[PDB]
Amino acid sequence: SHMRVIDREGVYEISLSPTGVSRVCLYPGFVDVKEADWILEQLCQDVPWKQRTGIREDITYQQPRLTAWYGELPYTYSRITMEPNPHWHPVLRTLKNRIEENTGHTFNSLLCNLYRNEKDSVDWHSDDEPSLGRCPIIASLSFGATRTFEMRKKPPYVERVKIPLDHGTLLIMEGATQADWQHRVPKEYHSREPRVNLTFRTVYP
Amino acid sequence: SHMRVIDREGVYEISLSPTGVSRVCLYPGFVDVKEADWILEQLCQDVPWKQRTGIREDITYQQPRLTAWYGELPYTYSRITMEPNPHWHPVLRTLKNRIEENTGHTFNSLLCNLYRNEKDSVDWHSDDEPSLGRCPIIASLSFGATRTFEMRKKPPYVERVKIPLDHGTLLIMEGATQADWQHRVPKEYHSREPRVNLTFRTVYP
Numbered sequence: 349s350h351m352r353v354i355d356r357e358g359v360y361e362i363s364l365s366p367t368g369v370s371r372v373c374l375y376p377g378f379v380d381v382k383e384a385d386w387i388l389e390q391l392c393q394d395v396p397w398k399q400r401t402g403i404r405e406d407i408t409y410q411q412p413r414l415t416a417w418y419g420e421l422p423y424t425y426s427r428i429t430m431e432p433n434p435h436w437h438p439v440l441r442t443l444k445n446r447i448e449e450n451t452g453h454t455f456n457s458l459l460c461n462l463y464r465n466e467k468d469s470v471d472w473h474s475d476d477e478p479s480l481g482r483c484p485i486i487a488s489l490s491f492g493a494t495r496t497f498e499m500r501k502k503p504p505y506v507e508r509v510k511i512p513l514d515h516g517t518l519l520i521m522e523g524a525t526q527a528d529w530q531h532r533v534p535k536e537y538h539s540r541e542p543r544v545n546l547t548f549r550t551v552y553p
Numbered sequence: 554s555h556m557r558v559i560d561r562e563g564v565y566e567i568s569l570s571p572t573g574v575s576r577v578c579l580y581p582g583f584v585d586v587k588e589a590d591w592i593l594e595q596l597c598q599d600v601p602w603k604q605r606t607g608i609r610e611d612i613t614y615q616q617p618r619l620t621a622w623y624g625e626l627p628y629t630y631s632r633i634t635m636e637p638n639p640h641w642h643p644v645l646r647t648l649k650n651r652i653e654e655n656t657g658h659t660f661n662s663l664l665c666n667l668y669r670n671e672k673d674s675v676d677w678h679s680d681d682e683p684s685l686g687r688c689p690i691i692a693s694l695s696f697g698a699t700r701t702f703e704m705r706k707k708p709p710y711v712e713r714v715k716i717p718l719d720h721g722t723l724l725i726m727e728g729a730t731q732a733d734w735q736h737r738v739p740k741e742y743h744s745r746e747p748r749v750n751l752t753f754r755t756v757y758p
């Protein structure tokens with residue numbers, strides 16, 4: 349099979365070309381369940397979730413998910429639409445610090461994603477906004493219902509990877525992953541409770 | 554013993570506090586011996602080595618080692634003294650690309666170090682120049698004679714680490730290593746042939 353499903357702790361080199369190594373690292377249980385329960389409640393209630401207008405392939409649409417931003421915002425993104433808050437919620441500051449102290453990598457930008465139910469999603473894309481630089485390090489922490497993080501390798505051989513992201517799981521993407529792969533979170537065809545995802549990035553001048 | 558000697562391939566978390574995880578990764582034989590022989594000759598001959606004036610604890614001195622720079626230069630360093638070349642030597646461009654494609658991390662600055670014999674050295678320091686940011690990723694590739702990379706943990710328990718860096722070995726430092734540790738290359742008391750070290754960094758605005 350040209351497809352792999354990964355739900356185990358580990359470091360995975362999913363491809364070595366054409367750009368270089370694409371690496372994803374999975375840490376299930378990074379936040380234990382009872383603390384993850386409490387974090388989910390606080391973020392659900394306190395983050396200023398909005399359904400925002402997006403563009404993809406130069407055309408404007410309402411995203412099928414709620415979002416909010418903290419810290420730095422990727423430079424080609426609209427400040428007026430995305431409303432990034434320079435004041436981090438204390439739970440989000442704690443989680444930022446925990447991820448940084450444990451992974452050794454720093455971040456200055458946070459996109460909060462809320463998938464309200466199975467009809468919410470994000471379509472195929474790469475995190476290749478240019479103010480992220482070449483080969484960015486991106487950390488993803490999930491709470492709430494499990495949803496699937498799908499990956500597909502771009503054309504010029506396992507060429508598809510699926511990662512269920514369950515409650516308290518940390519995912520890191522680094523290396524050539526954004527140059528050589530796309531990812532999405534598909535809609536589901538059975539009921540899903542809400543999911544909150546936190547995606548931490550570094551935005552540069 | 555409060556001291557560890559490391560010469561084996563691996564990922565090492567040498568401390569977890571006070572700042573976060575300090576991680577060093579060692580890859581002996583990153584360049585195979587015959588290619589490493591040829592690279593050593595070309596760099597020895599072609600890099601414009603100079604004995605440059607340094608400062609440490611606000612006082613000026615001639616460094617007991619030869620150096621040259623390529624690409625970006627850490628912002629508090631003098632351009633006139635360090636003479637960074639924006640045009641990379643083709644061997645150095647190849648090695649930069651190889652390190653990036655294999656590690657997944659990018660670099661924009663290179664300090665070349667030549668330890669002429671056992672009397673050359675670099676004293677205790679951290680790579681904590683502020684334009685490197687918090688918790689920089691630094692890659693080190695060595696050629697020629699083996700010399701020892703010593704590390705000592707800063708005071709507020711293995712608190713000392715020694716890493717022999719032999720011909721073709723790649724060393725990566727990341728995480729809290731520069732905040733929480735210092736490192737040096739000591740003089741030796743037996744003959745040493747020359748050693749070339751390449752230290753790749755990312756300098757930010």
Ligand SMILES: O=C(O)CCC(=O)C(=O)O
Nearest residue numbers: 459461488497533545547
């Ligand atoms: O919800 C997720 O896990 C993925 C979100 C994502 O790819 C993004 O925000 O860029």
Ligand SMILES: O=C(O)CCC(=O)C(=O)O
Nearest residue numbers: 664666693702738750752
């Ligand atoms: O020669 C070495 O391996 C170490 C050099 C070093 O620490 C530096 O250039 O900052």
Ligand SMILES: [Fe+3]
Nearest residue numbers: 355356357376
């Ligand atoms: Fe597991």
Ligand SMILES: [Fe+3]
Nearest residue numbers: 363365370528
């Ligand atoms: Fe790749």
Ligand SMILES: [Fe+3]
Nearest residue numbers: 473474475531
């Ligand atoms: Fe994404």
Ligand SMILES: [Fe+3]
Nearest residue numbers: 560561562581
């Ligand atoms: Fe080994």
Ligand SMILES: [Fe+3]
Nearest residue numbers: 568570575733
């Ligand atoms: Fe540490």
Ligand SMILES: [Fe+3]
Nearest residue numbers: 678679680736
């Ligand atoms: Fe150093």
